[PDB]
Design a protein around this ligand. Structure first.
Ligand SMILES: Nc1nc2c(ncn2[C@@H]2O[C@H](COP(=O)(O)OP(=O)(O)O)[C@@H](O)[C@H]2O)c(=O)[nH]1
Ligand SMILES: [Mg+2]
Lengths: 12, 369
């Protein structure tokens, strides 16, 4: 998932 | 080469006016000449210097209060400390408190610089001071008898006298020979504090230590009973990764884990490398009224919030023998009992909070269960 430049996020 | 060169965090500790700042400058000047080149208020002096093989990031603090605060919070991170003791005073109360703090916060090595030797031309006096330093170090589990003690004069070395500058080089030699290279974050057992959880179960956060790899087993530690799962994938900025490394914000797909099995405060970890605990001994600094902390002392029965990585956990405290209350600005040993277990090892940092306000900071000294 979910991020893209600098915060917590994800996928899998 | 300087890119491949190991980085070592060092710092000067010891009683006020013993020569920590003077020594810090004598170190930078002598090495430069010989080889070349949250709501808590952090007061520090940062300098960097090099030896042929190492790069040092050196912290020095103005007052005693700064050392307490900086060592507990981790702002003054040290792979090794240089205990400065003036031969003219010998060990003083802050020499003892700095060694004790070093033990509690996990400073793993202490080298001694017997300072102001330009003032003391007495071998019996110097050995008496060394004797007292080594006994004080051994008292706090440091190897007092095997610790390097350099006799010198930070001021005369800073004043350009080569015979005394030779003692600064000796001290630098021990930084190189005595303090081992610190264990890199990437080589430590895998650890990921969970920030966010999604169903697709993906858990997100910054890989604090080690590496996570697809196919490997992971443990979900903290809050509830420990759960084991296999990593089915790692993603970052929509791009699938083969593995997740320390320092990276990633997402981890966990096999057969459902969203309700993950709580806040839980960590992802290499199996059996970190355990949950409710009870521990810590070193804690309580903010002064002037730092936006508490206005009045607290007593046993104080139930604040302990913020461990991602979440607040309610806890109860045990005060040392003969300690009735804790004044704002005090730093004490505190035995804590949390309501829910947290994955923890010694050296783990936490904030003490009252609502959305930091009133204290601490470090886990001894995990108890
Ligand atoms: N005679 C002498 N004075 C020193 C030496 N090192 C420091 N001083 C003096 O001791 C005082 C306190 O030193 P300082 O480095 O500011 O102490 P700190 O509080 O531990 O940082 C100053 O007046 C320095 O010039 C030394 O080796 N010899
Ligand atoms: Mg100073």
């Amino acid at each position: 998932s979910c991020n893209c430049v600098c915060g917590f996020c994800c996928s899998x | 080469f300087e890119r491949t060169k190991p980085h070592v965090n060092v710092g000067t500790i010891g009683h006020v006016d013993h020569g920590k700042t003077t020594l810090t400058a004598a170190i930078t000047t002598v090495l430069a000449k010989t080889y070349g080149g949250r709501g808590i208020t952090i007061n520090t002096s940062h300098v960097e210097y090099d030896t042929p093989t190492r790069h040092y990031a050196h912290v020095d603090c103005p007052g005693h209060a700064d050392y307490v605060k900086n060592m507990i919070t981790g702002a003054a991170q040290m792979d090794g400390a240089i205990l400065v003791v003036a031969a003219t005073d010998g060990p003083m109360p802050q020499t003892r408190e700095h060694i004790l703090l070093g033990r509690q916060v996990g400073v793993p090595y202490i080298i001694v610089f017997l300072n102001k030797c330009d003032m003391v031309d007495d071998e019996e006096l110097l050995e008496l001071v060394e004797m007292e330093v080594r006994e004080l170090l051994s008292q706090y589990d440091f190897p007092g008898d095997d610790t390097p003690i350099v006799r010198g004069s930070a001021l005369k070395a800073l004043e350009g006298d080569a015979e005394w500058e030779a003692k600064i080089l000796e001290l630098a030699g021990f930084l190189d020979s005595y303090i081992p290279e610190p264990e890199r974050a990437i080589d430590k057992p895998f650890l990921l504090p969970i920030e966010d959880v999604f169903s697709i179960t993906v858990v997100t956060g910054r890989v604090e230590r080690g590496i996570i790899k697809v196919g490997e087993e992971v443990e979900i530690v903290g809050i509830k009973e420990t759960q084991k799962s296999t990593c089915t994938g790692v993603e970052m900025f929509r791009k699938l990764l083969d593995e997740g490394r320390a320092g990276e914000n990633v997402g981890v797909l966990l096999r057969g884990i459902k969203r309700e099995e993950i709580e806040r405060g839980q960590v992802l970890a290499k199996p059996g490398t970190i355990k949950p605990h409710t009870k521990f001994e810590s070193e804690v600094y309580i903010l002064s009224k002037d730092e936006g902390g508490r206005h009045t002392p607290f007593f046993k029965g104080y139930r604040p919030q302990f913020y461990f990585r991602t979440t607040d956990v309610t806890g109860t405290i045990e005060l040392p023998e003969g300690v009735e209350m804790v004044m704002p600005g005090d730093n004490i040993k505190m035995v804590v009992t949390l309501i829910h277990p947290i994955a923890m090892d010694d050296g783990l940092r936490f904030a003490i909070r009252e609502g959305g306000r930091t009133v204290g900071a601490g470090v886990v000294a001894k995990v108890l269960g």
